[PDB]
Every structure is written in structure tokens, then in C-alpha cells.
Amino acid sequence: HRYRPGTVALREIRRYQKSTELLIRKLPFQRLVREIAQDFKTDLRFQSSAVMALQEACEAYLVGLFEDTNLCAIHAKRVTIMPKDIQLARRIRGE
Amino acid sequence: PHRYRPGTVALREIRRYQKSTELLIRKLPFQRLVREIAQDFKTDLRFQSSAVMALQEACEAYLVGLFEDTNLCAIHAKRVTIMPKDIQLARRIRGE
Amino acid sequence: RSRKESYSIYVYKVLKQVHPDTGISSKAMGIMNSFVNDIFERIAGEASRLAHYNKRSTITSREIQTAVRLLLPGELAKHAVSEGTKAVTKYTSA
Amino acid sequence: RSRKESYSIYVYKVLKQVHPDTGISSKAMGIMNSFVNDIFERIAGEASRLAHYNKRSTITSREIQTAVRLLLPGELAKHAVSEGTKAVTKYTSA
Amino acid sequence: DNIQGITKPAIRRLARRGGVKRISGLIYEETRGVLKVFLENVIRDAVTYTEHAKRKTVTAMDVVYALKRQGRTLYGFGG
Amino acid sequence: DNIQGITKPAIRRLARRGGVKRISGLIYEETRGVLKVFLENVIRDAVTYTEHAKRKTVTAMDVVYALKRQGRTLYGFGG
Amino acid sequence: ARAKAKTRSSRAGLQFPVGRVHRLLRKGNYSERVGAGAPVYLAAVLEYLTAEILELAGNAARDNKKTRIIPRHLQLAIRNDEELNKLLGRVTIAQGGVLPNIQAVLLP
Amino acid sequence: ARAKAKTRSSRAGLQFPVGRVHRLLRKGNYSERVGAGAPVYLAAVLEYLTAEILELAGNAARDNKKTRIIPRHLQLAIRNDEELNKLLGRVTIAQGGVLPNIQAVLLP
DNA sequence: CTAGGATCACAATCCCGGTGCCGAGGCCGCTCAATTGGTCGTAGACAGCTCTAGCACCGCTTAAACGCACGTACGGATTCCGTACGTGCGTTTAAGCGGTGCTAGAGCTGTCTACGACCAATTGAGCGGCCTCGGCACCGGGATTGTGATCCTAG
DNA sequence: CTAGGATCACAATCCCGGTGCCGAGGCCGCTCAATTGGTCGTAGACAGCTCTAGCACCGCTTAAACGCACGTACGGAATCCGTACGTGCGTTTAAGCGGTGCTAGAGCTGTCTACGACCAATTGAGCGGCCTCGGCACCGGGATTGTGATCCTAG
Secondary structure: OOOOOOHHHHHHHHHHHHOOOOOOOHHHHHHHHHHHHHOOOOOOEEOHHHHHHHHHHHHHHHHHHHHHHHHHHHHOOOOEEOHHHHHHHHHHHOO | OOOOOOOHHHHHHHHHHHHOOOOOOOHHHHHHHHHHHHHOOOOOOEEOHHHHHHHHHHHHHHHHHHHHHHHHHHHHOOOOEEOHHHHHHHHHHHOO | OOOOOOOHHHHHHHHHHHOOOOEEOHHHHHHHHHHHHHHHHHHHHHHHHHHHHOOOOEEOHHHHHHHHHHHOOOHHHHHHHHHHHHHHHHHHOO | OOOOOOOHHHHHHHHHHHOOOOEEOHHHHHHHHHHHHHHHHHHHHHHHHHHHHOOOOEEOHHHHHHHHHHHOOOHHHHHHHHHHHHHHHHHHOO | OOHHHOOHHHHHHHHHHOOOOEEOOOHHHHHHHHHHHHHHHHHHHHHHHHHHOOOOEEOHHHHHHHHHHOOOEEEOOOO | OHHHHOOHHHHHHHHHHOOOOEEOOOHHHHHHHHHHHHHHHHHHHHHHHHHHOOOOEEOHHHHHHHHHHOOOEEEOOOO | OOOOOOOHHHHHOOOOOHHHHHHHHHOOOOOOEEOOHHHHHHHHHHHHHHHHHHHHHHHHHHHOOOOEEOHHHHHHHHHOOHHHHHHOOOEEEOOOOOOOOOOHHHOO | OOOOOOOHHHHHOOOOOHHHHHHHHHOOOOOOEEOOHHHHHHHHHHHHHHHHHHHHHHHHHHHOOOOEEOHHHHHHHHHOOHHHHHHOOOEEEOOOOOOOOOOHHHOO
């Protein structure tokens, strides 16, 4: 048995839209945060709740952007999101 | 006689209006609209001349910005004609 | 050690008024505290601006009412103003 | 007769310093007044928030500096801080 | 019937400043609607400010404030 | 190269919560770049707040404040 | 002997702390003076709004056969009401997730 | 006889009014107390920003063979500098117009 | 005979010169708000201490990520059609400008009173700490929904 | 022999009862912030007056809107190709969790001093008002740029 392209993609959409857990691995995200912060000030420490707040904000932002990217794609009569859709979304959003 | 190809005059107008700064909406109709709209909130309302001018400036800036974003949407759908679905998309993404 | 004030007690009282058999998680209580603080700030700040614009030094119930009308959308404002007015009336009659 | 204070004199002085032979229209002067008022209330408001967050009652040069760093983008903040620091130094030595 | 005062050539001029080359026939009504919504919002807030001051004349400062609180700061009219 | 820790399947999960059905292969790098920019901005404001308080530990309140001033208010972490 | 202490909240028939709201207004660098009615009004408004959102969240919880409100329920309540969505437009609810929404063009 | 009045602007080598800035800070409901250096710093920053904008506008005027700055020149100066555009992103300059920009795809 | 560059007619836009008018830049009087000199007190700087919570490391256990492969379906290029929008001309309309008249209401001043700040004594409401137990997450295993294709028939 | 529907296989989800754990809600002691009662000063409500600017109307000019005719180029539908993203099985890896240990620095407390508010005096800088002149807007003529198309040419 092989599901046709799209069936599993819709099942995943339903599953992740029903759940609320964070989708980025914590340890890699923490490393990224620390690496970025290193350029501003050295020997910075971070509260666990600081990293969690950052992760939450980043995930929310990215989900919203993917939504607007999806609307752009649908408007160009596509079903596939492309870099040009992210760029357009961001430009219109003012970013 | 001489007839300019579709697009030539449209680009000439784009250049002219993008170089000038005067207001493009006729003052008297805009004033009437403003007063009509304000009537629904409070009666016997007066308006300073500079209130109407401020409103007209803000509205025209807003509309120009929206037409710019509508144009970008059209260009992204491989069109050169702006359509209601471009305004709607722009506004939705803007959050309006 | 030491006190960090919060609106937990009052949120729980209101919840017990509206849903006697419904509880609330700590994370929802934190959300409700953040919400109450945010709205407080928004209202107080717009009342402050209103007062300043009119060269007045006192924030009264009028400033609060106007801020509510400016901030709360649609029927929320309608009902919020009603609630506030009733409370003030009750307060003024002790 | 009602006196309305404005930054016109100071905007003109600066213009005469940077462009001795260049004047300015009344509408541009109004634009520059609005600009100066807006940036003033952005900086002061940020400094106020900073002070409040740290449970301080005084707005000092440190709060202003931080507010400038937070508000002004990129090199604007680098030069603005320099300018501010120079002024304070000059002021402190009378 | 004052919304119709925003004529077809006015909308075309606004679009031309925005860099639009070709305009569909259905854009005019959409634009009129958008403008109406925007205006209603701003005027509503300006009138609220006017009423709070117990005035009967909407001032340019009421408008400026209304625009400011909607994130559309306007420079040139006293703030 | 810690930016590479944001894996292909993480980005796909994020897109799936956003309702995206099909994803181009070039989206992953774009997303990584966008995330990097966002993070840099937020962290730079949070560190500014930390430095003003003369602290060496970024607190959750620094982050909350940074988000707040960027118009991305976050609820659930003390404000 | 003086009179028994009667809280300003009880005089106004409110759950929210009028005295605390008053103190926060006076010490929040908002104005020089604060009227006596301002804390009462503000407290009443904040109590009404929290009652509304708690009621909607409790309804969502009950619909989900749950007896405790979680961030999910708060997000559902807020995003499903046009007015509360408009008030809380630029607000992120931690651990709230999103609304189930799939574009009609993507369905099989 | 006391000493000749020396303005705090002249002491700081500033054109902007330090005394006025101080008064506006004290009466603007920002904090309980205001440091002595705060008005000096703020005035210096304001002066720098004004100088920058005025310089760029004067340059645009001189490029347009004009002797007087108009709103147009200010708009040109602000929108042509990435940093000043970012600072004044959500600001509308009355009678400023827009920057000449035509999409490449529309050209003949 | 064509595709291509060259040449042409024409309208539109940039440029130079003269006129004039009204807004900008400067001078003057004064008045009020900023400066000088001094006092009082409390807010913040600085030092010291505590203990909490952040950082670093290690060992298993999977869950998830990486890689490769087969294939279908979605992006994209090409072609054709018809209609909808741009361009231009003649007619109509109402916007813009000036001038006059009027009065409502914005803006300011003076008086006085009620209301909000401030202080001292009192106390009860709200916060920290402890504890218990039931709402929830998790698990196994059936019932159910759904996708895909194999089978059967009338046509 | 084909299209459509009937039927089947069986993977993913949902539902149910049982387990047990650790977080939410309640109780107790205390302490400090809210209340009560009284004093005092000034901010704003109210009344009255002035004078400005917002509204209403009229006539005249002319620029802009409007309606219609015509044509063309652009949006949209259809067809075909091909590549590249999706679904899935196998191997790898490092995230997650639990535990242990160290120590840096965040939070709090005590003491002191200096920096800012407040007051009185005084004086000069900035604002309203008046006035003049020159910089820019406009009109006219001309040089130039650019579009649309007719022509001559190399091939």
C-alpha cells in the first residue's frame, strides 16, 4: 500500500494543527540562541525561561509567516510554497 | 492620425504623478464624504479646514501604499492588471 | 522569599462566579495575569494621553470611559462602559 | 496673544550651521517640529519604561543612552550616543 | 451618494502614483469600500476625542491623534 | 553552523502547522535566514536590556520586553 | 472606636482589588492626580473582560470534556471571537497553538 | 551681584534648549525625578538628528537648484537613506509625495 | 522577399528668460520662564552575605533525522481566442475662486468650592509555605473511519 | 471490452476502562498595605465675554469628468513534457532524561552622602506683531527627447 502524494501531508497538517507542543528541538535551538547572543556580549548566561520564551516567539512567528506564504502561493494558482512567496509575504508585511 | 500604443500614456502618467506632490482627490467631494461619515457618530459637527486637509492627506497616502502592494501582488501572479483579489490579498497579509 | 503581587486570587474568584465546577492550570493563570496587566497598561496609558492633551492633571472616570471606548472594539466597549458605570454608581452610594 | 512654544528657532539655527545659504518653508518647519516632538516622546517614553522596569525613580543619562541604543537603528545610534556623551562631558566640565 | 464623488479618474490617479499600469474595471468599487472603512475608523476616533473635550468642532489635533493611535502617524499638522 | 540545527523536518512541521501542503526544496534556506534575522533582532534588544540592568544573565523578562517593543507581545512568561 | 474596615471593592460590588488598582495608578507615572472614581471604573472594566474570557474558555473546556482551563482553551476562545481577536491581535498565547484551518483548494 | 546668566545650552555647546527639554521632561509624567545629565543628553541627540535630516534635505534642494527646503526635499532625504527610512517607517510626511519607482516588468 | 537599421513626422518634456507677489527672514517690545544661590532629605551607590539556579559532564534509550529509491503529479512552457481595457474626441458638469454676510462656538479670565493629596493609627486582607488527593496523561485493545484497488455488471 | 459502482483489504484514528502521579486548591501564620478620620490647599467647574473662523450663498470661468467608438494585447483556458518533491524502508545519531557536582551571580540588607526637589529673586531669551524684498511659480518660446512608422538596405 502506498498513499498518493498529499494524503499524508494533509494528515500531518491536521495533526500539527490540533497539537500545541513545540516543534523545534530544544538543544539545537538553545545552541543557536547562544551562538547569536555571543556576537553582542561575551560570557552571557541564559535563564531556562528566556530560551523557552525565545523558542515560543520564533515558532509563532514562523507559523504565521508560513500561513501568509501559503496564501501567496494559492493566489499564484500554485500549491507549492517557494522563496518568492516568502519574500512577497515579508515585503507586504513591512518586514 | 497618431495613436500611442496601450501602455505609453499609462507610463507617462505614472512618471508625472510620481514626480508631483499635489493632492489628487477633488477637495469638495472629499469634504462632503467626510461630513456624511461623521454625521453617523455625532450631529451638528463642524470641521476645521486643517482637519479635512489632514484626513485627505492620510487617506491618499494610505491608498497609494495599498495600490503599491496591490501592484506587487499582481506582478507576483504574472499579471500586469490589478484586480479585487490583489487588494484583498494585500489587505489580508497587512492584517487589515 | 518576599511578595510578588498578582491577580490570581481575583481571577479565581471571577472563575468561581462564572464556572463553579471549572478549575484552572498554573499556565492559564499566568496567561490571565499577563492579560490583566497588559489591559491595565493600555487603558491607563490612553487615559494619561487624554488628560495630557487637554492640559488636565487628574485622571477621572471620564478619562477611563473615553479610553475604554477608544480601545475596546464594538460591543465589548458597550458592555464594559455599562459595567464601569454601574460600579461607579454603586460606589458613589456606598 | 496665546504663546505656543516650538522648536523653530533651534531648527533654524542648526540649518544655518549646516547650510548657511539655505532657507526653509513654513510647511517644512512644521514637519521638523513634528519630527522633534515625536522623537522626544519616543526617547522619553523608552527611558521611562527602562527606569520603571528596574524599580528606579530617576531618569539619568544612562536611561537616555539605553533608550537611544534601543530606538535609533544602526550607525544613527553609534553617532547619537557619541554626540550625547560629548555634550555631557562638556557640560560636566562647565 | 457622496462615496461616488471619489470618481474613476481620481482612483486611476492614485493608482498611477502607486506605479500601477493596468487597472481592472472592478477595482473602483473595491477601493471605494476600502476608503470608506478607513475613513469611518479615523473619523470615529477623532469624534471620540472631540466629544471628550466637550467641543463641537473637530480640530486637526483630534485627527492627528486618531491617526497616531492607529499607527499612521502624520507629520505636518502640529504633531 | 548551529543554524543547521534547524533541520529540514522541523521546518516541514512548522509549515504543516501553517497549513502548507507542498514545499519547495529552496524554502529551507530562506526560512533559516528569516529565523536568523528575527532572532538577531530580539536577542540584540534583550541583551541591551540585560546590560542596562548590569546583569550577566538574560532573564525571561528581558525577552518579554524585547518582544513587546517590537510589537510581538508574548503572553505566559510574566507579561 | 472607628468603623469596621469596608473595602472599596465591596462597596462597588467588585471582585477586583480597587485599592490595589488605585495604588498602581498613583505609582505608575500616569498623571499628577488620580480621581476617586478612576480605580473603581478601571477595576470594573478589567473584571468584566476577565469574566468574559474565562466564561468562553470554560465553555471550550466543557466542549472538550475537560474540567480545567489550559492555554489551548484560552487561544480557542480568543481566536473564535471577532472582537476578542481584534483586541488581542498582536498577542501570542504561549502553548496556544493555532486554529484548525485548511485552504479549500488543498482538499482532495 | 551674582554671576551673568549662562544658558545650559551654551555650557553644553548645544543649539537646542536644555532648560526647555528639562521642563518638558519634569512635567511630562515620565518619572518622579530627572537627572541633571538627562536633558543635556536628550538635547544633544535631538540636535544631531535634526542636523542630519536638515543636511540631507539641503543637499536634495541644492541638487534641485532650489534655495528653500520643502516637504518634498525632506521626503526624498528620508526615503533615500535606509536608516532614516527605518526610523520613520510608519510616518507620513504631508505634501511629500513618493519616490519614483516603476517595476521593471512594466517597462516597454 | 525578408529582417534589420536608418530616416522621418510629430507630440511631449526639459530649459531659458521675464514678471510679479506674498511668504520668509529680520527688528522691536516685554514678560515670563529659565538661571543663580542655598537648604533639606532621601534615593541610589557601594560593600558584604546567602543560596539558588545556571553550567558542565556522563550513560542509556530510543525517537527522530539522514539517505536513497521509485514514481506520479504539479510547475511551466507554448498556442490560440475573444473580450475587456486603454486611447482619443466632443459634450456636460461641477470644482475652484473671489467676495459678502452672519453667528456659533472656541478661547480666555475670574471666583470659589469641592475634591484629592498627606499623615497617623489600626487592622485584616493577601502572600509564602505545607499538604493532600483527583484530574489528567498514558497504556492496551478493540471498534470505527477512511483511502486505495480489486471485482462485477450493464452497457 | 469499458466505466462506473460495489465490494474488499487494512492502516490510522478514535474510544473505553484501568493505572498512578504530581500539580491545584485549601489551610495557617504573619506583616504591611489598605482603611478611617481629619486638615489643607488648589484644580477645575461654572459664568461671562470677546472675536474668529466656520457655514451659507452667489456668480463666473474652465478644467475635469463622462460617454462612446475602436482596436489590440493580455488574461485565461487547453495541451504536453519532465523533473522533482512525496512516501517509504533502513541505518545512524544525538535529543532527552536522570543524576551528580561546582560555583557564579542574583537578590537582599545596611550605611552613608550627594544629587535633586523646592524656594526666592532676578533677568534675558523667545514669542507676538509689523514690515520689506527676493525666490519661486507661471507664461511664452524654443531645443530636445522619444514614440510610431515608413523607407532603403544587406543578405
